[PDB]
Structure formats: C-alpha cells, structure tokens
Amino acid sequence: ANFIKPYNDDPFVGHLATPITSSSLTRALLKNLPAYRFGLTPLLRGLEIGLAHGYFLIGPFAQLGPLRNSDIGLLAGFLSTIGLILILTLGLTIYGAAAFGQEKSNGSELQTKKSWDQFKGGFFVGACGSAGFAFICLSSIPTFAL
Amino acid sequence: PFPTFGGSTGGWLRAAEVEEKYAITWTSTKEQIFEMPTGGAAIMRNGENLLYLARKEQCLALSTQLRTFKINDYKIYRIFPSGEVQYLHPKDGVFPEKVNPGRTSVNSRGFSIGKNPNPASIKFSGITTYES
Amino acid sequence: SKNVQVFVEKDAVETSFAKWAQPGHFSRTLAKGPKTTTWIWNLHADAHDFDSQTSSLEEVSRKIFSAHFGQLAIIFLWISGMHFHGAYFSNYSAWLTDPISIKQSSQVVWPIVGQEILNADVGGNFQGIQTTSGWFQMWRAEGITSEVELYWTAIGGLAMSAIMLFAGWFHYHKAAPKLEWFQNAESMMNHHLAGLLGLGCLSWSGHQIHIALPINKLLDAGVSPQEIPLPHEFLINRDLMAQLYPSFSKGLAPFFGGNWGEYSDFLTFKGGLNPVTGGLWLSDIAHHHLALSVLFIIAGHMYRTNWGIGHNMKEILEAHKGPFTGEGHKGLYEILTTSWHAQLAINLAMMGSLSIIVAHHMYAMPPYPYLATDYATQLSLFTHHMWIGGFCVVGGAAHGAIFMVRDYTPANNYNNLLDRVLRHRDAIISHLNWVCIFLGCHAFGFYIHNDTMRALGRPQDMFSDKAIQLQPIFAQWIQNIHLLAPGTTAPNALATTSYAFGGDVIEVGGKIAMMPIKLGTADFMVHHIHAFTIHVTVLILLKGVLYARSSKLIPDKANLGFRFPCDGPGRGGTCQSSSWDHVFLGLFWMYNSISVVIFHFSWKMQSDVWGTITPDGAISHITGGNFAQSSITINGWLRDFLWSQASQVIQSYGSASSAYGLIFLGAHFIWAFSLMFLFSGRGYWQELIESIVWAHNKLNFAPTIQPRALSITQGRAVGLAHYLLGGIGTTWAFFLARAISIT
Amino acid sequence: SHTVKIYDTCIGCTQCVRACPTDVLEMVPWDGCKSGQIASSPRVEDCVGCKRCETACPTDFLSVRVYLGAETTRSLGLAY
Amino acid sequence: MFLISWRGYWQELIETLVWAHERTPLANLIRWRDKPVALSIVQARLVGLVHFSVGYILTYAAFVIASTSGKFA
Amino acid sequence: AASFLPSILVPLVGLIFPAFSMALFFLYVQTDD
Amino acid sequence: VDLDYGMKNSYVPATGGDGGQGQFGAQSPNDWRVAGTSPVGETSYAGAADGGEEPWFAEAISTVSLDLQKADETLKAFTKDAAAFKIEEFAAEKPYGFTSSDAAMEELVGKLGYSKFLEMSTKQLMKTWGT
Amino acid sequence: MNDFQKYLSTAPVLLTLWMTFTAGFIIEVNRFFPDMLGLY
Ligand code: CLA
Ligand code: CLA
Ligand code: CLA
Ligand code: CLA
Ligand code: CLA
Ligand code: CLA
Ligand SMILES: CC1=C(/C=C/C(C)=C/C=C/C(C)=C/C=C/C=C(C)/C=C/C=C(C)/C=C/C2=C(C)CCCC2(C)C)C(C)(C)CCC1
Ligand SMILES: CC1=C(C/C=C(\C)CCC[C@H](C)CCC[C@H](C)CCCC(C)C)C(=O)c2ccccc2C1=O
Ligand code: SF4
C-alpha cells in the first residue's frame, strides 16, 4: 500500500498527494471555508473571514498589553485591535490596486478589482464588529456554575 | 510515453502553466534507471519517452546523462501556454559541436580583444565599447 | 568454503625511500611537478583523499586500516608522555597525601627569559604549571599510590606505540588484507561488541574489584599511601581482602552457585556521591562495568558468521518496510558495505554525540575522587568534550555529502528511503526554515524585549520570575520524578543518581561538590536558544547533503564535485553553492551554538552551585545568584558575565597566570586576522602579487614556481581556521584563568 | 540578455560550444583559422552568465567574452 | 552575515520558500508580482559594509559620550 | 497651546506619515505606466 | 506554426547591455503576473484549469502539453530552411538523373528518414541517390 | 641513502631544521648573555 502518489497523476508536477494534502478531512475543511466555499458573494466572504479574525485578536492585546492591569485595560485592548485591523485593511486595499489594476469586467470573481474592494469592505466591518463582540463578552465572564 | 517515476516536490510550478514550459524526448533500447535533475530516480521505457521540465538547462543536463547511455536522438522543445511549440535542440539536426555547412556567424568581432574602443571615446552615445 | 575467512596478500608494497623524495607521487596531476605555488597547497590538501588517488576499493581500504594503526601509535605516545611527566615533573605524591590543599601540576618550564614566572607555587615544595586535565584524580581512583608505577605505565605506552607502528607497516607492506576480508560486517560487530567492549569491561572490573577498590578504601580511611599494601599483596592474600570486604572469605563459590547476593559487599547499587571524596562510589562503578560486560558479550552473538545461527543484517533491513516508505531500508546494506564515507558519516556523528553526553553526565555525576571540588578541571573537561563533539558532528555531515556526490548510484537506490527523501527535499527544507525562524524570533525576542523594558524603566513588563514568567514546567516535573525514584521506581537504589535533580548539598573541604540545580524562567529562555542554534546548524548541513547532487539553480552540481568554488557570476550569482561551502557555513553556527552552551554552564554553576558552605548551613556561591535576574537581558551577560568574569585574565600580568593574558590577546588578534580572508577575494590579492613580482624581476630574480594567490576555496578555509582558533582560544584562556582563581 | 562576442583569435577548438549549459554557442564554417571553423553565439537569449565557456578557451586572452547585462527569467535561471 | 555568506546558498533556500507559498492553501490566494530572488553579489557587499559601518560608529558614539559624561559630568 | 504640539505631531510624523509614504512607493513601483 | 510567436513578445531591447531577442525571442509572449487561487466554481488565470473540488491546488493541473504528432510538424517547420540548403547543394553537384528539388527531397527522405537526411553530407547523399 | 638524503633535502624538512638551529642559537645566546636592551 502506498499512501503517497503523484498529484493529479502527473509524475512531473512539483507536488504530491499525501494524506495531509489530499484527505477527506482536508478536502472537506478547505471546501467549506469562507475563502473557497461555493455561492458566497465577495462581501460575505470578507465578512466571515473578518468576524473570525477579529474575535481572537482582542485577547493578546487585552491580557498582555501595556495597560493590562489597568481598569481600562479591556477598552485599551479593543482600541489596539481596531488599529491593527486598520493596518491590515490598508494592506488589502493596496494589494488590490497593484494586483488587479483600475477597471474590471468579469465580475463576481474574487480576483477582480470590484470584487476585491467588496471583499475588503466586508473584512473591515466584520473584524471591527467581532472585536466589539469580544469586548462585550469579556466584560463579564460566566463561571457556568450551578 | 512518460518514464516511470513516482513523483517529487521538485517538479514544475505555475510558471510552467502561465509563462513557459519545456519538454525533452528520446528513444531507448532497454529499460534502465536514470537520475532526473529534479531529484530522484526514474526508469525509462523501452522505446519513446517524454518528460517535462521548467528550464532548458535541466533538459540539457538530462541529455548529457542520456549520452552516457549511448542515446543521441534526444530533442528539446519549448511549449508556450497557448500551445505553440518551438523546436530548440538539436536546432539544425546537427549537434552544435559539429560544424554544419549552412550556419552563419553571429556576434563576431574581427580583431583581438585588445582592439576594442576606449570607454571615454563613446561617452554619451548609449553604446558600449564591446558593441562599438 | 567458510563464509568468513581471512584473505591476505603477501609482500604487497616494497618499502623504500624513493617515493619520499618524489613529492606528489600519490596524485597523477601533482606528480608532473610544481609550476605554481598552488601545487604546494594541493599536495597537502589531497594527501589523505585515497578515493581520488586510486580507483580500487581494496587499495583504499588497505590504506585506511594501516593509517588507523598510525593514529593509535600517536595516541599511545601521547598517553605515555603524560604518565612520564606525572612521574618526573609532578607533585602527585604530595597531592595524594593532602588532596584538598596541594594543587595539581605536571608541567614545568625551563628558567629561560623570565618565563619562569609561569612556574607557580602550586604546593608540596614544587613549582610548576597547574594542569587541568584531571590525571591525578584518575590515577588515585586506579590506585597508583607511587610514582614508580607511573613510570612503568609510561614504558608500556612506548612499547605499545611501537607495536602499533609495526602493525601498520606489516599490514600494508607485508601482509595486506584483501577486500573480501574487510567486507565482513557481521563478524566485525560480533568481535568488537563482545571482545573489544565486553572483555574490556570485564577486565576493567577485575582491576577495580581486586586492586582499586581495596586501596581506595584504605586511602579514604586515612592510611598513609606508604602504609597501604602493594597491589600484588591484595591479589595474593585473600585474608587481607576479607578484612576490607568480608565476602572474599567465601571465595568464588558463591559465584558458581547462584548466590550472587553474598558479593553485595563490593557490588552495590548505592547511588549518590561518596561523602569523603565527592565522587561516585567505586563499588557501584565495579557493578556497572560488570553488568555492562555481560550485556555486550551477549549482544556480540547476534549476527551470523560461520555456524548458521544468527542474524543477517541485510535481511533485517529489507524486511522493515511500510505503507508510507516504499521499499524501505533496501539498499542500505550495500551502501554501508561499499562506501567508507557513508560509514564515517554515521560513526563520526555518533562519536561526537557521545562526547556531548559525556560532558553532561560527567559533571552531574562526578566519576573521580576529588574532581568536583576542583572547579578548574570540571570546567575544562566539560568545555573540551563539548567542542570535540561539535566538530565531529559537523564532520559526519560533511562526509555524508561526499557520499552523495561520489558514491550514490541511482540504480541501486530506487524507491528506497534515500530516494524518497531526495524526492521531497523541498518540503523538508522549507519546513525547517520556518521552524528556525519561529524559534529564533520568539527565543531571542524575549531577551530584546526585556532589554528594552528595563531600559525604559518598565521592569514589571519583563519576562522574568518577578513579572510575566515562563517556567519550564515539563523539566521541573521530570526532576521530581527522578528525585523520588530511589525507593519507588528504583526500589533497590539508595540515593538519587545525581544530586542535581534534588537532595542535599555534598561538600568536600568546605567547598560545594554538588547541589540541587533549580530551573526557572531564565533557564527556559536559554534552553530554547540552544534549540534555535542547533536547528539552524542542521538546516545548513542537511541542505548541503540533500542538494549536493543537484538543485533548481544548478541542475548538474554533481559533475562539478563536492568542493567547487562556484558555477559563475550568472543566474544572478552562484557563489558558495557547493556542499563543501555548506559545511563551511555550518561550522560557524556550531561555534555559536557551543559557545552559548559552555557560557551557560559557566555562569549557572558559579552562581547556583559552586561555592563554599559554612560548618552551619550558609551557602555562598561564587557569583552570588546573579543568574536569575541578570541572564534575562543581553546587557546582563555583557556586564555580569563577560565584563566581570574577565577581571582575572586582564589582571594576570606579573603572575603565574600571565600566560593566559597573553594568549587571550593573541587569540583576539588571530580572530581578527581571519576576517581579511573571509571578506576579501582572490582577485585583489593576485593583482597585488603581480606588482610585487615586478619588483623582484626588476632586480633580475624571480621564482620559477610562479607566485599565485590562494584559491577561492582555500581562502575560505584559511579564514574559518583562524576564526575558530581565535574564538576558541580566547574563551580557553578566559575560562582557565578565571577557574584557577575560583578554585 | 547577456552579450557574448567572439574574436578573430579563435582556433576552432570547439571546447566552448561543448561547455555551454544552455546551447548558446555553435561552430560555424570559417577560413581565418587552420581548423576552418569559428564559434558563434546565435542564441544569447538563453545565456545564464556562467562563463564556463570563457574558462574553456585556450587562447592567450579569451576569444569568447561574455559581458553580463540585462536580466530576464531565463538569464536569472528561475525555474519558478 | 552578508560579508561571509555568499549568494548561492541563499538563492537555493529562497527557491524552497517559493514552493511552499505556492503549495500552501489560503496563502495561495495572494501572490507576488515581482519574483522573489536573492540579493546580488555586489549588493550584499554594500549591504554588509553599511551594517558594519553603522554599528561601528554607533557603538563608539555611545562609549565616548557615556564614558566621558558618566565620569566627569 | 503650542505645548500640546509634541503630543499631536509626533503620533502623525512617526506613524501616519511613514505609512502613507510607503504605500505610495509600493503603488508607484508596482504600476506599469 | 508561427515561427515568430516567441519573437512577437513585449520585450524591447535596450541600447547597450542587452543581447537582444536572440534567435527564439527573449521572453514568453504571455505575462507571468497572473492572479492567485479562486473559490470553487471560479477561474482566475484566464484559460486556467478548473480546480474542481480542490481549487487550492489548481495550478498543479496541467493544461499545457506536447502532441507527439504536432511535435513532428514543429520539427519540420523550424528545420525547413536547413533542409532547403542541404538539398540545394545536392542539386548543384550534378545529381544523377535529377528531377525536382522537392521530388529529390521526398526520395532522399523516403529513405534515411528525415532526421538522418538533415545530418548527412552532400557526398553521402549523392552516394545514396546514385540509384 | 641517496633517496633519504633527498627527502631530508625537501623544503619543509630543511626549514624546520634551519629554524630549530636558529632558534636554538638565539636561545643559547640569551642564556649566557641575558637581559640586553642595547650593546651595553
Ligand atoms: C548577530 C548577527 C546575526 C544575526 C542577527 C543573524 C540572523 C539570522 N541568520 Mg545569520 N549569520 C551571521 C550573523 C547573524 N545572522 C553570520 C556572521 C553568519 C556567517 C556564518 C551567518 C550565517 C547564517 C546562515 C548560513 C544562516 C543564517 C540564518 C539566520 C536567520 C535565522 C532565522 C531567524 O532566527 O530569524 C530571526 C532573526 C532575528 C534577527 C531574530 C531577532 C529579530 C527580532 C528579535 C524578532 C522580531 C522582529 C520582527 C520580525 C520584526 C520587527 C519589526 C521592526 C524591528 C522593524 C536570521 C535571519 C539562517 C537562515 O536564514 O535560516 C532561517 C541560515 O541558514 N545565518
Ligand atoms: C518576539 C518575541 C516577543 C514576544 C512574545 C513579546 C511579547 C509582548 N510584548 Mg514585546 N518586544 C519584543 C519581542 C517580544 N515581545 C521586541 C523584540 C521588542 C523590541 C522592539 C519588543 C517591544 C515591546 C514594547 C515596546 C511593548 C511590548 C509589549 C508586549 C506584550 C504585548 C503583546 C502584544 O500586544 O502582542 C500582540 C500579538 C498579536 C496581535 C498576535 C500574537 C501572535 C498570535 C497569538 C500567533 C498565533 C499563532 C497560531 C497559534 C497559529 C495556529 C492557528 C491554528 C491553530 C488555527 C507581550 C507580553 C507591550 C507590553 O505591554 O509589554 C509587556 C509593549 O508596550 N513589546
Ligand atoms: C604528547 C607528547 C609529549 C609532549 C607534548 C611533551 C612536551 C614536553 N616535554 Mg616530554 N616526554 C614525552 C612526551 C611528550 N612531552 C615522552 C613520551 C617522554 C618519555 C621519553 C618525555 C620525556 C621528557 C623529558 C625527559 C623531558 C620532557 C620535557 C618536555 C617539555 C620540553 C619539551 C622539549 O624538549 O622542548 C625542547 C625540544 C627539544 C629539545 C627537541 C628539539 C627539537 C627537534 C630537533 C625538532 C624536531 C626535528 C624534526 C622532527 C625533523 C624531522 C625529521 C623527519 C625524519 C621527521 C615539553 C613541555 C622536558 C622538560 O619538561 O624539562 C623540564 C624534559 O626534560 N619530556
Ligand atoms: C576480539 C577481537 C578484536 C578486537 C579486540 C578488535 C579491536 C579493534 N579493532 Mg578490530 N577486527 C576484528 C577483531 C577485533 N578487533 C576482526 C575479526 C576484524 C575483521 C572482521 C576486525 C577488523 C577491524 C578493522 C577493519 C578495523 C578494526 C579496528 C579496531 C580498533 C578500534 C579502535 C579502538 O577501539 O581502539 C582501542 C585500542 C586499544 C584497545 C589498544 C589495544 C589494541 C590491541 C590490538 C588489542 C589486542 C588484544 C590485547 C593484546 C589484549 C590481550 C589480552 C591479554 C592481556 C590477556 C580496536 C583496537 C580499527 C582500527 O583502528 O584498527 C587499527 C579498524 O579500522 N578492526
Ligand atoms: C575520523 C575523522 C576524520 C577522517 C578520517 C577524515 C578523513 C577525510 N576527510 Mg574529513 N572531516 C572531519 C573528520 C575526519 N575526516 C571533521 C570532524 C570535519 C569537520 C571539520 C571534516 C571536514 C572535512 C572536509 C570539509 C573535507 C574533508 C576531507 C577529507 C578527506 C581528505 C582529507 C585531507 O584533505 O587530508 C589532508 C588533511 C589536512 C590538510 C588537515 C591538516 C590540518 C589542518 C592544517 C588544520 C590544523 C589545525 C590545527 C589543529 C591547529 C593548530 C594550532 C597551532 C598551529 C597554534 C579524508 C577522507 C576533504 C575531502 O576532499 O574529502 C574527500 C574535504 O573537503 N573532511
Ligand atoms: C513615533 C512613532 C510611534 C508612536 C507614537 C507609538 C505609540 C505607541 N506604541 Mg509603538 N512602536 C513604534 C512607533 C511608535 N509607537 C515602532 C517603530 C515600533 C516597532 C519597534 C513600535 C512597537 C510597539 C509595540 C510592540 C507596542 C507599541 C505600543 C504603543 C502604544 C503604547 C502607549 C499606550 O497607551 O498603549 C496602550 C494602547 C492604546 C491606549 C491604544 C491607542 C490607540 C491606537 C494606537 C490607535 C491606532 C489607530 C491608528 C490610527 C491606525 C494606523 C493607521 C495607518 C494608516 C497608519 C503607543 C500608542 C504598545 C501598544 O499597546 O500598542 C497599541 C505595544 O505593545 N509600540
Ligand atoms: C484547535 C482545533 C480546533 C480549532 C479551534 C479554533 C481555531 C477556534 C477558533 C474560533 C474562533 C476564532 C471563533 C470566532 C468567533 C467569532 C465570533 C463569534 C464573532 C461574532 C461577531 C458577531 C456576533 C457580530 C458582530 C457585529 C457585527 C458583525 C458588526 C456590527 C456590530 C456587531 C457587534 C453586531 C478545533 C476545536 C476546531 C478542533 C481541533 C483543532
Ligand atoms: C540573508 C541573505 C539574503 C536574503 C535577504 C533578503 C531576501 C532580504 C529580505 C528582507 C528585506 C528587508 C527586504 C524586505 C522588503 C519588504 C518585503 C518590503 C518591500 C517593499 C517594497 C516596496 C520595497 C540574500 O539574498 C543574500 C545574497 C547574497 C549574499 C548574502 C545574502 C544573505 O545573507
Ligand atoms: S556564459 Fe554560459 S550560457 Fe553563456 S555562452 Fe558561455 S557557457 Fe553558454
């Protein structure tokens, strides 16, 4: 039994079909991720990605930042996260400009200027909102005790 | 007609699909093991064989190895993304190391290397001394 | 007939001095004669590359066997000299009587040019250089007692050296074995694993049980060396032994019977360290070797030779194959039985790895009497064996690459483990690169973060045991396990294998020999840095082995060789792309890695272990425990370690430690000198030489062996050599001078 | 990309064309030398700049000179 | 690093990194427009000299100032 | 008050300005006129 | 076959410091600067290969290949001039009962294949075409 | 003998012998005339 085979049955491509690269688990997870899922509009793709990344970013800042022990530590953490989101958003904007150009036509192809702009917008809204949600959640932590 | 190989992570990448690609072909009289430039060992087939690579040098390197097996019928081509193909080597059917009547000289200067012009003389000209 | 037989050719090579007068005889190219200075250098660089001197494995093999005899002869002469110098130029006798006060010395300088200052007042009405190799302790453990005995072992050494040299000549010029003889791995392993190691251990146990143990007991008790009976007396009079160990009375009767328990008097599993000498109990050491001996002898009966029973390594290797590894270990046997370079790779790596282990195990569990309290010897040995190990490990990698470029054959390796490795090399290297970056950024970042924070007046934000803390929880756990082992997981033991894990403070002579070593945030930070350094070294070396034959950049690197300068200025630049160059770069990282390790040892010990303890419980460490809050920042290392602990070397002038000061300076000079070879190029030098030659010509004289500049590769080699010598030399003096004082 | 030029001092040893790793050089008929052959550089678009050719020339000073210049994917030997 | 280590080694390593980015899902979405390559021979020399020089001047600048001020000022 | 200027300008000069400048350079070098 | 397809590229040789388009062109006509991967059911690099359910590894799906039959044609087209020169010389040397260049070519290549024809001296050819 | 003499005539060997001799004589001079910073 061989669990490693040439990818796509092409013995000369620079890739291999390993259990990690091509397993039902990996295929399933990647197919349903917002980035590659089928049917999602550019805006929704960005939104989901943003919602996911914003929620986990408030943590590092809130618990290890300069004002962690201050009563306003969580608030400061939120502000810091928003700042990071802005930096990342600038990057997305700039990338789109260089990679796609100035006027597009295909449409509904994440890889076009219009679609990219919509994607970026979604990310910003989702990320900032997600960070806010974490702020509300971390304001009062449940002990789940009966 | 692909030789028997199990795959590698040293094969071609996107450039081969969007910029340009190469291919070598040869005929063998026996099935033998050769080492491929990408990395690893493969077994050639008894007859026609075709292999794809990303660089001309990689193809010509394999040709050197083939000559050791006494194979001198190799041909190298460049396939563009649209499907256009260019025959590259042996270009005129005769290996370059053998003078073939019908080939014209190119990039030849009729004087010793020391007779090239002085850099200052060609200043503000755009040409170089070796092209002057 | 027999699978294993002896085949030897008589009178293979005539002994004469003709070739001696024909430098370069070994090479076809060099033999023609010298025309430029390059010939001279090449002569020395291709001297021992037998593979390039001949095309027959038999011939190459024959040379290697004989050459090895030569090394053995040299080693024997070395040991002989040491014993002689310890018999005629040492204070062993005095030290033996008062080991705590007298300082070990076995080298004396002639009274020429004020160099006599180097002869220190070590003690015992003797003046000489304080040695740090640990000979005195070893001799005491063996039970030497006299200096006459040292003289005789010296004579034996000289004799042995001669025998080895004769053997080399004999087995190359008169009786040279054929290739078939060499290719008998199963037999060799059976003999070496049962005879060399098994019988060796058993023989040593005999000496320890009959000669060393008894004498050392008397010495520890207080008996004057002169009053202790001579070694032969113990061997003959069983009654004398019975007095010390009351079981010899029973004789060997208990042994032949199954009652091995009666020998518990001398064979014990006490553990811990002898309170009087501060070294492992010899009784335990005797049982150690006896047990190991049995194991080795049994293991030597695993491979088939000429009697049917046994294992054939080829079969074992080929059977072990799995779903993810193709043909598995098929093809490896042939490689290791037809390629010396491959064998050297594995053997050299393992040898170096062992040296590093010896360094760690020999300080935590001091093996010799009166060694732990001698801080100088302890530091010297740890650093020495740490270095030897690093070089050997890198060497293994080098020879591994030479194999890929010179002996690897695609035909014999189809879908085997080696082939599959070379088929996913990109993945392996890519991932390792990331691992190195991750570790490096996080590990060193901790230090930079702390430095910035302390400088900005924000000490509460540092990664320290007093702020954000990064405790080594896993290691702390293992320590507890080992501490509680005696009596539980190790029921028959009586104490911890090492007091480092935990226990009490063992003190000898008012000085601390061993103490529990604790692990905190600083230790976490340093350990992870060690990981980073080692990982990067592996990256460079492994990349060299995997991409030795080919690469996307240079598809035909194999034809170029293992040691080529480059392929050209094209492809954007192909400088230093050979496997040799990867080894070149790897050595620099090995230097860094080992340097940090030895520094960790020096500061940790002088801060949390070594020191003095009062009659009551008051422990004063040499540096005062500064490691915890000072080793967490780079400024701390520069100030509390290098700057402070270097006060000894810099202030050594006018003392017996003056030599170290001079060497410290000299080493710095050599290190800097090397940077001119590592930063410059052959072109500038060649042109300069041209102008210089003009002068000589203008005066009607010039060498026929035209002066030429060193090759690109040699330039790099010369640079690395001087760099390593200078760096290691500097630390050598720094450590030794500091240690002499602290001791 | 790079520029390779051949000079009249060539002797038609063919060593250069046998060393090129990318078939940039060829041997063409000529009458200036006893061998009756000279080297040419018809396909300089594939020169990587190795200078192996120069290393092989036997003439006092290289009859084949490679002058490095503009860089392209081919000249930079990029398989990616 | 720039002075003692030369291009060949680095170029090969960069090649492996390119492979990874092109084969890692999610990151594949983003791609470069300028092929990643190693620094040139002369460039590395310049970069190295600059690093050597800047460090040289900075370190002495601190010493000459802190030592003099810390003792006499 | 001018005294407040250090706390209003430094944030801009060391953070906002460098960012926009780098962005512009990238857009300039990634464009094919 | 467009023998100039490669030459017809966007590359513009510089004044000094450039070898030029050489013999087969200096750069591919197509631009390598294409986009990255796309969501399932979408395409990015123009005539790219659909990744199916694994769009992440779409670039590993080959779409550019060489047809052996087509390979023969490219060999003939790019070596047409050489063949012409060869046959012309054969014709110049008073061929025995010569007919037409093309006819001679067919006869001479009917035997000795085509590759062998390209690698044979006029003398050998005349010997071969003695009949 | 002749061949051995040639080996002893090799550059490396001769240098070592010569330098040993030179070093020795310098050392011996300092042994009998020590501590000199000038011709007295
Ligand atoms: C102090 C000198 C120095 C430093 C810092 C480095 C640094 C490095 N060398 Mg190197 N090297 C040096 C001297 C040095 N070298 C010398 C003298 C030689 C000659 C032998 C070499 C030869 C050499 C080779 C042959 C190799 C390296 C490799 C590496 C890299 C290891 C990966 C890593 O840890 O990344 C982390 C790098 C750091 C500098 C860590 C500190 C940076 C901070 C603390 C982390 C956070 C910063 C963040 C990323 C950005 C901050 C933003 C802001 C500052 C602008 C790293 C870039 C290896 C490599 O590239 O493989 C990965 C490798 O193969 N080196
Ligand atoms: C590289 C090592 C390192 C680390 C770990 C830290 C850590 C820290 N620094 Mg420090 N620092 C460092 C180097 C480092 N420093 C260096 C080299 C400098 C000099 C320039 C400084 C200068 C500095 C200053 C000036 C300050 C800090 C501060 C801080 C704290 C705030 C953390 C923060 O906001 O991060 C935010 C982190 C993130 C947004 C992301 C974290 C990375 C994520 C967790 C990785 C996740 C990977 C994931 C597991 C992958 C798998 C995913 C899969 C399972 C799906 C924190 C304790 C601040 C402080 O208060 O000090 C205590 C502060 O004011 N640092
Ligand atoms: C590892 C081996 C080793 C080392 C490093 C030393 C080192 C030392 N020994 Mg020692 N020794 C050794 C083994 C060793 N010994 C052995 C095995 C013995 C037993 C025979 C001795 C017996 C011994 C005595 C009896 C004495 C020393 C002394 C010394 C010290 C002065 C050395 C000396 O003579 O300088 C000066 C060097 C010379 C006089 C030799 C002259 C230099 C020669 C001519 C150069 C070589 C010529 C060259 C090879 C030509 C090549 C020809 C070709 C055929 C190869 C020095 C520290 C002396 C000492 O410490 O006194 C206080 C001293 O008296 N040793
Ligand atoms: C039991 C038999 C036996 C023993 C003891 C050895 C021992 C050794 N072999 Mg070995 N060998 C054997 C059988 C044996 N071999 C067989 C059967 C083969 C053929 C398959 C080989 C083929 C072989 C090769 C090809 C090589 C060795 C090498 C070595 C040496 C390794 C270096 C080392 O550990 O230094 C330890 C050094 C010592 C312990 C010094 C003493 C060495 C002498 C010779 C011990 C002899 C016994 C001694 C006289 C004690 C007698 C007991 C008496 C007092 C009661 C070592 C001396 C290597 C080497 O360097 O050889 C020169 C090497 O390259 N062996
Ligand atoms: C068991 C140990 C061992 C053995 C048997 C070999 C054997 C061999 N190695 Mg190897 N090697 C080893 C360990 C070993 N190596 C280690 C540990 C390393 C890592 C540093 C290397 C690195 C290495 C490289 C990089 C190369 C070899 C090569 C070779 C081959 C030819 C050696 C040669 O040129 O001779 C001639 C030997 C010399 C010129 C050495 C002379 C000593 C020099 C001058 C340094 C001296 C330093 C000195 C101690 C400092 C004194 C200071 C004082 C003056 C103040 C040979 C098969 C070469 C080869 O081509 O293989 C096929 C090659 O390229 N090896
Ligand atoms: C002149 C430039 C400059 C300035 C003004 C600052 C200012 C600051 N840095 Mg800093 N930094 C700088 C350069 C600078 N940095 C550089 C060059 C590095 C690299 C070595 C760092 C690395 C660094 C680290 C690693 C950390 C800081 C942190 C901080 C904050 C600590 C004070 C505080 O209350 O934190 C508490 C934080 C707040 C009260 C939140 C303030 C609101 C934020 C800043 C809004 C940001 C939005 C902004 C407009 C988005 C930019 C858009 C883009 C187009 C430019 C403070 C805002 C720490 C921090 O907490 O970061 C936020 C921290 O962990 N810095
Ligand atoms: C390890 C692992 C794993 C993973 C894990 C993870 C990675 C997780 C993550 C997670 C996450 C990361 C999550 C996130 C979340 C988020 C959220 C939940 C958000 C929300 C938001 C909201 C809800 C909203 C908001 C808003 C908006 C939108 C705007 C407006 C305003 C508001 C506020 C409204 C598992 C277990 C699988 C398995 C095993 C392996
Ligand atoms: C590390 C190293 C590299 C690799 C170093 C690299 C690739 C530097 C990469 C990081 C620098 C800081 C460039 C990163 C720039 C950012 C990506 C932002 C660029 C934005 C543009 C608009 C400028 C070499 O190429 C090299 C070549 C020859 C000899 C030695 C070496 C060498 O030692
Ligand atoms: S430099 Fe290299 S590629 Fe260019 S002609 Fe010379 S050998 Fe060929």
Side-chain angles (χ1 to χ4, degrees), chain C residues 418-429:
Chain C
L418 180 53
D419 181 17
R420 302 172 73 92
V421 169
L422 305 170
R423 286 162 49 184
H424 70 285
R425 53 183 179 181
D426 305 52
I428 304 178
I429 300 304

Side-chain angles (χ1 to χ4, degrees), chain C residues 65 68-69 72 76 164 181-182 184 187-188 191-192 195-196:
Chain C
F65 190 48
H68 288 180
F69 279 110
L72 286 178
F76 268 118
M164 300 301 172
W181 182 83
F182 294 98
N184 290 316
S187 177
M188 191 173 303
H191 283 87
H192 287 187
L196 181 55

Side-chain angles (χ1 to χ4, degrees), chain C residues 20-43:
Chain C
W20 300 45
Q22 314 166 11
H25 65 278
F26 55 84
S27 167
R28 299 163 306 276
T29 61
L30 297 176
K32 303 189 177 184
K35 296 175 180 58
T36 56
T37 56
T38 305
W39 180 92
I40 299 173
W41 303 113
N42 295 0
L43 172 67

Side-chain angles (χ1 to χ4, degrees), chain G residues 61-118:
Chain G
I61 311 302
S62 183
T63 74
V64 180
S65 62
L66 173 63
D67 171 23
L68 294 308
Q69 175 270 356
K70 168 194 56 181
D72 182 22
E73 287 74 82
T74 180
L75 175 276
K76 306 295 179 54
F78 285 84
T79 62
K80 189 180 189 62
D81 302 3
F85 165 90
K86 178 72 67 62
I87 187 63
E88 184 59 19
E89 182 178 355
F90 173 90
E93 304 187 6
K94 300 306 167 298
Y96 158 83
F98 186 79
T99 56
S100 170
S101 297
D102 306 357
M105 281 287 304
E106 278 65 289
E107 313 154 9
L108 295 176
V109 304
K111 50 187 175 297
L112 289 33
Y114 177 74
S115 178
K116 181 55 162 55
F117 163 79
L118 299 180

Side-chain angles (χ1 to χ4, degrees), chain H residues 3-39:
Chain H
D3 298 356
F4 188 61
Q5 292 177 351
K6 286 201 54 182
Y7 166 76
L8 301 182
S9 297
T10 57
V13 176
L14 286 180
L15 186 59
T16 301
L17 301 175
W18 192 245
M19 298 309 301
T20 302
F21 168 76
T22 298
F25 91 76
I26 301 179
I27 298 178
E28 296 290 6
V29 172
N30 298 14
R31 179 156 69 98
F32 301 107
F33 313 93
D35 290 349
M36 301 191 64
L37 34 49
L39 203 58

Side-chain angles (χ1 to χ4, degrees), chain B residues 59-77:
Chain B
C59 297
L60 283 163
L62 177 55
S63 75
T64 301
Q65 184 178 178
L66 298 179
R67 286 192 165 182
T68 79
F69 304 102
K70 303 308 174 180
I71 304 173
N72 294 337
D73 62 277
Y74 49 89
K75 287 177 299 305
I76 304 179
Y77 305 81

Side-chain angles (χ1 to χ4, degrees), chain C residues 666-677:
Chain C
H668 277 76
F669 175 87
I670 295 300
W671 181 81
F673 185 69
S674 70
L675 305 181
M676 85 167 174
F677 296 90

